């Protein structure tokens, strides 16, 4: 609603897996509304029992993020399944799905949150303030850089669930 226009919702809805098709979208976490901190993200994502949609709008107004099969949580380990993918609308809408090379889907930490893994790199990286973000090409999704540069700044960030 606030970060996405009808253009974004339709192109995203067409690439969501079958198990969430026709499930209404519930806003679970929002930087605009809840307090900008990875800690707060964890608290709102706690007691979520569904896959989530991560929506990032950076300081260049470009929109990208991820669909995750499980709520974001602090984890000793990588978790999630292969239905997880990354997406960007810059320079055009493109979805980077599981490549089958590894299973390093989601990794929650106290200092950072990252999706994708393998040999050090990652697909998406956010710091504890949900401020400095980073995006590289990773083996989990074989994505290109979701943002303009490798480094980006989070302007607004939303997490949507499918209760």
Author numbering: 21 to 183
Paper text:
Plates were set up yielding crystal hits for the NCOA7 protein under the 96 screening conditions. Comparison between the RT structure and cryo-structures was not feasible due to difference in crystallization condition and space group.
